[model samples]
Target: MLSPKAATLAERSAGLAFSLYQAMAKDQAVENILLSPVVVASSLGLVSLGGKATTASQAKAVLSAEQLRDEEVHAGLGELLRSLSNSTARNVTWKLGSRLYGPSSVSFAEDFVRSSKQHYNCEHSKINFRDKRSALQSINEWAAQTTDGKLPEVTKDVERTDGALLVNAMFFKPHWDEKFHHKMVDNRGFMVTRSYTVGVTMMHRTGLYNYYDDEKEKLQIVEMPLAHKLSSLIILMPHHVEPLERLEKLLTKEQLKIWMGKMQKKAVAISLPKGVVEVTHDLQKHLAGLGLTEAIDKNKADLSRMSGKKDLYLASVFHATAFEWDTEGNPFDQDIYGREELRSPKLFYADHPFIFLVRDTQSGSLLFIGRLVRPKGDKMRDELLEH
Candidate 1:
């Protein structure tokens, strides 16, 4: 029988395994989900931390190679191969890893491997590495190699003694889909939830977005699929003054599914100005907010099979992400590929300050949370001009 904690991780990571199975069914969905979490969770947290620390020195170098500014960009991901090493471990294991490639040239394979071994407290540390020049190619290769070509672009094979390492990589390049034209967006207004008036840019846009409205909670939710729908940005707007708390109270799984379900064949009209928005959060804190405390706690956690016994625990959690709008090229092209293939329309709304989340559909992992208001205005444009 599976332990309770193991069962939970399986459920959380099920989406990822399901998607992989849909694409390629080499492993059972439950097994794949368990294998990926340890890697992905650790990667998401560590990569963000790594990127932020090196941003100043690596910004220009990364921008030249990846076309994205070094603003709080986190990269380098890792995870524990807890279950693959043993069958009993598999039942208690939560292993997975990934790399985020930016415009800059950086060596992160070593760091990724080291971080995972330490965090998951594996009994043996072993990894197979692969190297590639381009970030996207590396990611694809890592995926392919890890699954024995089942998940392409997942890792760069590096030499390791033990056969327990699985790695993957992700390369991202995007300019704002719609470049905000006018710069005169400095003004003060009531932000309802925040309760104080602040200067912000009011931006506008119309595109295919995941649109849903919660009539019971009086909230409107819109989701924009990034270059890949496997990951998406969700925006939630409140119709009432205290929508923030109300929004918080309304994030039930049933509500989420219903909102997503009703989003089909919907057209939304959005209008709002740019406003100054600043946010700071710890991923662990956010997870707790979402009712995920027991899973992240080390002392109280139960991940024994990783070391042939439950001797390890989760140490830390982190996250970092950025979004820019530019008219330089067609963002529609990016949206087109994800949408055309999946039959799911992309939603873009520049309305008031809304909640945004970077979620991995396959793993049900929420990597980043943010908000954009009149973001197309000058300050933001200046920040992203180089990218």
Candidate 2:
């Protein structure tokens, strides 16, 4: 159990993550998305420490840290990140990493660098932005190493005028507490939209899972526990054939808590598509619309605390995340209670598009959030099934 202060911080962090998701979802062009709001907020929160006056205020506002003092916000974030990294069980591995890269000619404030290392577990490096090729490779290498090679490259281009780049990466690999049998997997039709449909590999499992249905909200939720019950994959499915945008608009921290509380254990036969999603987000455009204008503006931005040099504003806020779900498990563990139980189960087929989020149950942090609009190609589908 978390202390009152710690719990409040966790809720606030979740709220900020959801807020960023809503902001990013406003883009009509992005039909499919995979975002780690925790990563985005933490990266920006670290940058907020280097800001002063109105510049600092804008960073805080964008991260929903207006009510708390600077120290309190940093302390809260530190606690939250620590809780997430330390609270998980052995079977699940969740890693969050951040990096600050700047030119060697620029000198950063001692306080800002020290606090960033102490609070966020971030690393600082000096690289020549003039040599775009070397800078890109160095940053990409760091990102790949931190994420266990899940994300090979976070950004493609780097310019000398762009003073700095803030990159955040999160990687999660957890076996399900109740693994689906590989034999039961079959190719099924997944509806991307009303008119378009694609064949996808669907993994089937019948188990007593935590479930909920909100008739008033027209939503159904299921919590699939990960190994050691440290985390869960929660699927929020709308009752009607509606676009995921409607559900995204209605999602709130309070609603998530309510749904989580209301979920009851019931025998459910689950049909989920097996695939992976890799996404790269350029947050500058979205952050601007969310009132984070000053932080991204080279002229107006105030990151003076970070460096005494001029024009040291954030050039880009790059975030990358990779997520996959399939019938994979620890071979040593033989706890297969779901298969042994003989009872009538309710059908829950995710044949249509739905919203899903991987959450750390201990800290109440959202690890990954995405909407499955389409599946991988047939070649990749064969490889996924072989596992």
Candidate 3:
């Protein structure tokens, strides 16, 4: 388990990590030019802050003890970045990089060329370099090569660079780690704005977990850690008495740490809407909202570390995400059976319109962010709305 300080840093920055995802998946019309640095900075900043605490306390355990905090940080950053990348591809146009470099995956690469050109407003050579058959084949090869054949099947493509842009060409295959049994999913109606109710599937789970109350902001914080306690999904639910706007305003690094410190171990039941929820977003606006103006400013931002080319500026960033909880057939039963089952914990939320995020513990990077609602379009619609 991470020390309290390390844990709080992880929890507080989870949302920011997701924000990076949304930025990367942003639509074309909006100026994507200035978005990347802001996303990178915000993600790095929190991690830097959090890593300090983790290193200080776990220094003995991870550093001198041969646990390898440096390698852990590097690998952790990569995994977190990939998770955020995967989240950004959910239900959106973004594909994996392998799609472009693979065999069968590029079969219809030419089909979207016209639209792609118009969407990105760029003209390039050989948009369909690899045919669909070849594209898919390459993607599989790439996945196997990257994961040492552990993941023979690749979900997305590895993007290519055409001197100007880094193109994405594949999509990832991911489902809920905890498969929600069809029986467990309840068909409940979700209200969008108090007037529109979207009939959706909701999933419920009950168990012992970490729960925190933010009295200052009038919200509840619940954390669900993944397999290693290194990655986690955090939910911030505002009290009915206080609007989300107020809660957002009240949220700060200090206040958040305080709230996290006050968290008590408790056994609780949680029910979350199991609807097909997806969110695509442009993070530039949000970064601006967070006062990271210079970071995204094309003229002023400094991202020389990304590449040696001075002409290079962050083009745009966007992200899409999907979250589903499941309790179905035991896929991992063969390994540990009931022993593993004991480690399995179910998470739930009986509320709506909360801030959800994914974070990597080592690098402190935010991978994805979204406010779950309906399964389509940008949650921040102004930039990409059907104008």
Candidate 4:
């Protein structure tokens, strides 16, 4: 069992996660919305340390972190990141990274730097923000290298008057169990709505799994293990053909706990999309909506701890949660489970929009969660077309 401090951090992060999904869902054109609770909360919370008085308190309240003491929050962050990194196996790379960058000409206070280094284990560096091209390229290159080349670049080009960047990037490639070892791909139709069905190649598999049928809730939940139960890809799909909006409204930490507690081991046939989503969120508006107003405003923002003068403010907060499912089999592909009991398997066909999340089972922290509405193309391609 995790410590109470860590558990509380997870609970609060889940709160942020649910709220963030709603913020992203407000856009009509966005079919998929991905966010990592740990990434966003940790990065934002780290910077919030620079906030004084009301700004700090406001940031804490938005993340539901007012209950935790100053040092307790930092300790819990270390616990969350530590437990998550311990989830790695030989063939899989489920890694999380955070980097803080600002203008190299100014000196940052050692108080925040030392504490952040001790707790968050985050690396801080100064880049030439005056040279716009170099600063953007430098941050982008760090994310590309840190995420193991999954997301080539993460920053969105724009006119910026400030230089600080708070970024959290992740790369997920799990070692699937032998059940989903052989993937079968086919041209499948994804029902986006009553009138439109987009064709996509779906990855299919069948095996005895940990699942639950919530008849009363009108949903089917499945939990697939990654790296020997240290991590899980929990999928929640609404069975009825109604709009996903109803289901989205019901998202809560308590609801997730109840669903997880009801899961049972059974035979399940599942199919999911194999596409990459790499889009940057501005986060100024959404964070403002979440009661984070002072941090981003130039004249109002306070970060004296960062540059020793309350002159520093954030450019923006950008997080890129990248996922790619590979078909390659693991070298340790021997049968780990005994023969399955003969029974009719339940079909968890995600031929329509569904919600999925990756969790670090040990720490109880959510890694990634999003609704996969349309599964055909990359979000970055659309951005390029617009540019």
How many clashing residue pairs appear in each of the predictions shown? 52, 0, 63, 0
Over 4 Å off, model 2: 1-3, 63-67, 87-92, 127-134, 157-161, 182-186, 213-219, 239-242, 257-262, 329-342, 378-387
Write down the lDDT of every candidate, Cα atoms only. 0.36, 0.74, 0.40, 0.72
Error of 1 at 171 (Å): 13
Per-residue alpha-carbon lDDT of candidate 1 for residues 120-177, written as tens digits (9 for 90 to 100): 3312222223333443354444444433332333323222212122233221122223
**lDDT of model 3, residue 287:** 46
Candidate 4 weakest ten by summed lDDT: 378-387
How good is model 4 by TM-score? 0.84
What would the TM-scores of all predictions be? 0.40, 0.84, 0.48, 0.84
lDDT, candidate 2, 300-352, per-residue tens: 88888888655787777777665666687544345556455637876789988
Task: Judging by lDDT, tell me the better candidate of 1 and 3.
Answer: 3
- The residue-by-residue lDDT of candidate 4 on 289-345, one tens digit each, is 778877777788877777778767776677776676654433343454544642468
Residue-level error in angstroms, candidate 3, position 174: 8.7
At residue 236, candidate 1 shows an lDDT of: 71
Across 1-387, the per-residue lDDT of candidate 3 in tens digits comes to: 244433333443454443443443343332111112212322333222122223222322211222434334333333333444433333332232211111211222242334323222222222342454654464456534433333345334424322122222223222333333566666555444454444556666544457886666567787665534545566777666222445545455566567668766555456776533322233445644444444344454443322222332222223322233444422333343334443544334544556565554454545344444343222332232432
Clashes of 2: 0
